[PDB]
Design an enzyme around this catalytic site. Sequence first.
Site, short mmCIF file in Angstrom:
data_model
loop_
_atom_site.label_atom_id
_atom_site.label_comp_id
_atom_site.label_asym_id
_atom_site.label_seq_id
_atom_site.Cartn_x
_atom_site.Cartn_y
_atom_site.Cartn_z
N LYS A 17 0.74 -1.40 0.10
CA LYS A 17 0.09 -0.01 -0.05
C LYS A 17 0.99 1.19 0.07
O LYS A 17 0.45 2.14 -0.86
CB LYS A 17 -1.00 -0.09 1.15
CG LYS A 17 -2.10 1.39 1.09
CD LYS A 17 -2.98 1.20 2.39
CE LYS A 17 -3.79 2.48 2.30
NZ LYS A 17 -4.75 2.24 3.64
N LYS A 36 13.21 -0.90 -1.46
CA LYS A 36 11.97 -0.82 -0.83
C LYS A 36 11.49 0.73 -1.02
O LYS A 36 12.39 1.28 -0.62
CB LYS A 36 11.80 -1.27 0.41
CG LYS A 36 10.26 -1.57 0.72
CD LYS A 36 10.03 -2.95 1.64
CE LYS A 36 8.90 -2.65 2.72
NZ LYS A 36 8.71 -3.98 3.34
N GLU A 85 18.48 -6.48 1.86
CA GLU A 85 19.29 -7.67 1.27
C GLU A 85 18.10 -8.24 0.48
O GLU A 85 17.13 -8.26 0.66
CB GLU A 85 19.63 -8.58 2.63
CG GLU A 85 19.42 -10.04 2.44
CD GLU A 85 20.06 -10.77 3.39
OE1 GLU A 85 19.99 -10.31 4.74
OE2 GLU A 85 20.17 -12.00 3.21
N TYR A 86 18.59 -8.98 -0.60
CA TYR A 86 17.69 -9.67 -1.50
C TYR A 86 17.66 -11.04 -1.22
O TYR A 86 18.63 -11.78 -0.98
CB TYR A 86 18.19 -9.42 -2.99
CG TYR A 86 17.72 -10.08 -3.99
CD1 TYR A 86 16.10 -10.13 -4.34
CD2 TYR A 86 18.33 -11.27 -4.85
CE1 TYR A 86 15.41 -11.05 -5.21
CE2 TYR A 86 17.52 -11.84 -5.76
CZ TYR A 86 16.19 -11.84 -5.94
OH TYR A 86 15.69 -12.82 -7.08
N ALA A 87 16.46 -11.75 -1.25
CA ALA A 87 16.09 -13.11 -0.98
C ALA A 87 15.50 -13.67 -2.00
O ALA A 87 14.27 -13.46 -2.68
CB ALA A 87 15.10 -13.13 0.16
N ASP A 130 6.52 -9.39 12.88
CA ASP A 130 5.52 -10.09 12.20
C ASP A 130 5.95 -11.18 11.47
O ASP A 130 6.74 -11.36 10.57
CB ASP A 130 4.99 -9.17 11.01
CG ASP A 130 3.75 -8.17 11.56
OD1 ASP A 130 3.94 -7.50 12.74
OD2 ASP A 130 2.83 -7.91 10.87
N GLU A 134 3.83 -14.65 4.69
CA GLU A 134 3.89 -13.66 3.57
C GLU A 134 5.08 -12.70 3.94
O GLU A 134 5.56 -11.90 2.92
CB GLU A 134 2.65 -12.89 3.17
CG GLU A 134 1.37 -13.56 3.52
CD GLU A 134 0.75 -13.77 4.89
OE1 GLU A 134 0.52 -14.60 5.02
OE2 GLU A 134 1.02 -12.85 5.41
N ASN A 135 5.35 -12.42 5.22
CA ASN A 135 6.62 -11.85 5.72
C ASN A 135 7.92 -12.50 5.83
O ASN A 135 8.79 -11.89 6.21
CB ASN A 135 6.12 -11.00 7.18
CG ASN A 135 4.83 -10.30 6.92
OD1 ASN A 135 4.36 -9.86 6.09
ND2 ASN A 135 4.68 -9.78 7.68
N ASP A 148 9.47 -9.06 7.72
CA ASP A 148 8.94 -7.95 8.79
C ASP A 148 9.26 -6.57 8.27
O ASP A 148 9.00 -6.46 6.93
CB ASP A 148 9.63 -8.28 10.23
CG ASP A 148 8.46 -7.49 11.09
OD1 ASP A 148 7.61 -8.10 11.40
OD2 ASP A 148 8.74 -6.58 11.74
CL1 LIG Z 1 8.94 -9.41 2.17
C1 LIG Z 1 8.09 -9.48 0.66
C2 LIG Z 1 7.03 -10.24 0.18
C3 LIG Z 1 6.54 -10.31 -1.00
C4 LIG Z 1 7.32 -9.65 -1.90
C5 LIG Z 1 8.34 -8.73 -1.81
C6 LIG Z 1 8.92 -8.71 -0.26
N1 LIG Z 1 10.07 -8.22 -0.03
C7 LIG Z 1 11.41 -8.70 -0.21
C8 LIG Z 1 12.25 -8.24 0.49
C9 LIG Z 1 13.64 -8.80 0.03
N2 LIG Z 1 13.64 -9.78 -1.02
C10 LIG Z 1 12.44 -10.30 -1.52
N3 LIG Z 1 12.66 -11.19 -2.32
C11 LIG Z 1 11.58 -11.82 -3.13
C12 LIG Z 1 12.05 -12.72 -4.40
C13 LIG Z 1 11.17 -13.20 -5.27
C14 LIG Z 1 9.66 -12.70 -4.98
C15 LIG Z 1 8.95 -13.55 -5.85
N4 LIG Z 1 8.15 -14.45 -5.64
N5 LIG Z 1 7.49 -14.92 -6.86
N6 LIG Z 1 7.69 -13.91 -7.64
N7 LIG Z 1 8.70 -12.89 -7.34
C16 LIG Z 1 9.41 -12.01 -4.01
C17 LIG Z 1 10.29 -11.37 -3.00
N8 LIG Z 1 11.56 -9.64 -1.08
#
Ligand SMILES: Clc1ccccc1Nc1ccnc(Nc2ccc(-c3nnn[nH]3)cc2)n1
Length: 263
Positions: A17, A36, A85-87, A130, A134-135, A148
Site C-alpha cells: 500500500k 523498497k 538484502e535480496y532473498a 510479524d 507472507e513476511n 518483517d
Molecule cells: Cl517481504 C516481501 C513479500 C513479497 C514480495 C516482496 C517482499 N520483499 C522482499 C524483500 C527482500 N527480498 C525479497 N525477495 C523476493 C524474491 C522473489 C519474490 C517472488 N516470488 N515470486 N515472484 N517473485 C518475492 C520476493 N522480497
Amino acid sequence: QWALEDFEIGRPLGKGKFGNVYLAREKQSKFILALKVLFKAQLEKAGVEHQLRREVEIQSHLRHPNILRLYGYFHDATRVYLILEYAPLGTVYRELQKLSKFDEQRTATYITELANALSYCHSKRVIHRDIKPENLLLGSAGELKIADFGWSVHAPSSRRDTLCGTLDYLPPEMIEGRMHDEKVDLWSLGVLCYEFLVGKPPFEANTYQETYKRISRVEFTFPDFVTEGARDLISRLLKHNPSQRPMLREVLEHPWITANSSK
Ligand SMILES: Clc1ccccc1Nc1ccnc(Nc2ccc(-c3nnn[nH]3)cc2)n1
C-alpha cells in the site's frame, strides 16, 4: 550517501500500500539487492513518519542470518528508500501455496530458524516481529529470513486470503486491545507451526467474528495426520495465558524440534 541513481531497477518483487519493493543492483559493484520504495504522502495519512525513521535505525542494527538485513536508506522528496538484502526464493507463503503443506523435516527446521531469529531480536529489546508466511522470505539456498519491517508487500497471487489473513496470527491479548508484551511472538510460532504442517491456520474461519471467537477461546483442532510431538509443541505455544507459553529456548529444546530438524 546513496541516491536512486546509484541503482539499476528490475521488476517489482512486491507491491504493497505504501509502495513497492523492486529487484535492484548497485551500479558499480553490480551487486544485487532489493529496493523498497515507500511513497510518504501515503505515510502521512497512516500517521507513520519520522517515528519510523527513528525506527529504521533498529532494523539497521539487527544482524542475523535469519533476519533480512537493511543495508541502508535514503529519501528524496516524495519517496523513502530502504536498501535491503535480496532473498532469491521469495516467500514461505508462495512455497506453501506450491507444496500445499510442509513436512516435519522443514517445519521444525523453519521453526528453529524463527526461534533463533526472535531470541536474537529479544536480546536487542525487539519484540512482536510479524511472523506471517507472507513476511517470511527464503534466502540463497534454503534459509529463512524474517522480512518483517516495512509493512506488507505482496507478490502477485491468491485473492482468497487478501484480507481475512490478518487476524489469524494475532494472539488474544493483542486483538482484545489489552496491552501486549514480549510473549506475543511465541503465540505466532504456534500458529505458523500448525500452518506449516496443516496448510491452514488453526483459527481460519469464514468471518472475522468467528475467527476472533476461535482465537479468544483457543478453539482449534488437529487433522489426524499431525504427529503428537507436533501437537504437544503447538498446544504449548497457544495458551490464552501468555505466562503459560514457553521461553524461546524450550522451543528449540522441544524433543519434536530436536528430533525432526534437517538442521
Ligand atoms: Cl517481504 C516481501 C513479500 C513479497 C514480495 C516482496 C517482499 N520483499 C522482499 C524483500 C527482500 N527480498 C525479497 N525477495 C523476493 C524474491 C522473489 C519474490 C517472488 N516470488 N515470486 N515472484 N517473485 C518475492 C520476493 N522480497
